[PDB]
Amino acid sequence: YRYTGKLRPHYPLMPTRPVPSYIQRPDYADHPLGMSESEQALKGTSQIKLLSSEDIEGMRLVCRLAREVLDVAAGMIKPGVTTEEIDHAVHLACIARNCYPSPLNYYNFPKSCCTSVNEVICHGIPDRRPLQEGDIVNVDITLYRNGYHGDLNETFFVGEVDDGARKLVQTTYECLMQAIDAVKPGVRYRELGNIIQKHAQANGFSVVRSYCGHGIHKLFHTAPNVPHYAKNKAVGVMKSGHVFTIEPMICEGGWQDETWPDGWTAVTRDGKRSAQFEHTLLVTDTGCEILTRRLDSARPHFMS
Ligand SMILES: CO[C@@H](C(=O)NCC[C@H](c1ccccc1)c1ccco1)[C@H](O)[C@@H](O)[C@H](O)/C=C/C(C)(C)C
Ligand SMILES: [Mn+2]
Ligand SMILES: [Mn+2]
Ligand code: NA
Known part of the structure; x- marks a missing residue:
C-alpha cells in the first residue's frame, strides 16, 4: 500500500470494548458481520419516513445526548492525546447516557466513533497515534x-494551526450551514449539493463524491441519500417530518478518495487535507430544527 500522505495507522488497536448488557443494542450489534437486517430489508427503496410525534421526541433526545458526547470529545483535543483515548472517553460517555455507540460493530467497524486526521476524509479508526500540534x-x-x-461531527484544531487549515475548516462549516439554511418543505434533496459545491469552489476547494448524508432514525443509514456535490441526481423532496443528515467533506486538493487496507479509512488520493461537519436535521414548517445543535454556546468548537 502506498500511503497518500504522512499519516499512518498506529497499531495494535485495543481489544473491542464491551457495552454492558443493560444498554439497548441495535440489530447489527450482534450480527457477526455487523450487518443490519432492518436496513438491508430497505436497501432498494427511495421512500422516506414521515416521523411520528413519538419518533420526533426520540430523535430530539438521542441527538442532544450525541451532542453532549461530541462536547466531551472536543474537550480532550490537545497535542499528545491519542485518538484511542478519545474513543475510550466517548465509549464511557455513551454508556453513562445509557446509549449504545452506534458505530461499534456497524459492518464490523471496530470502535465507538470515527477520528479523522488531516488527509483522512472520514471513517478514521481511533488508534495509538498521538495528536500533533498543527493537525x-x-x-x-x-x-x-x-x-x-x-449523528453529528465537528473538525477541531490541535493547538495552533496554519492559515490553510483555518480556511478549509471555516469554509467546510459554512458549506454545512448554508445547506441547512436552504432546508424547508418542498425543496429537492438534490439541491443541497449545488449549494455546498458552489461555496467550496468559491474558496478553491473540492467536494468529496463518494460519501453522502442520509436519512437516520430507527435505521442508522436510510433514505434519502443526500449528496454534497452539484448536479447530483438524488431523488426526493423535503417534507415536515423528514429527518436526515448533511455532512459535507471538503478538500484542499482534488475530490478523489481512496481507502486504506483497513477497509475503512478514506483518504484524499493527493494527500491534501479534508475537513467535515455534520448535523442531524428535522424538517419543520418554518425550515428545520438542528437536532444536534449546541444548546449553550453560539459557535462550533473550532471558533473558541
Ligand atoms: C461520511 O460518513 C457517513 C456515511 O458513510 N454516509 C454514507 C451513507 C450511505 C451511502 C450509500 C451509498 C453511496 C453513498 C452513501 C447511505 C445513504 C442512504 C442510505 O445509505 C456516515 O453516516 C457517518 O456520518 C457515520 O458517523 C459513520 C458511520 C460508520 C459507522 C459507517 C463509520
Ligand atoms: Mn457521523
Ligand atoms: Mn452520518
Ligand atoms: Na481530514
Missing part, C-alpha cells in the same frame, strides 16, 4: 437510544 481532527459521534440514532 486538524474530526470526531464523528453517533448514539443509539430507545431505538433511534443521532
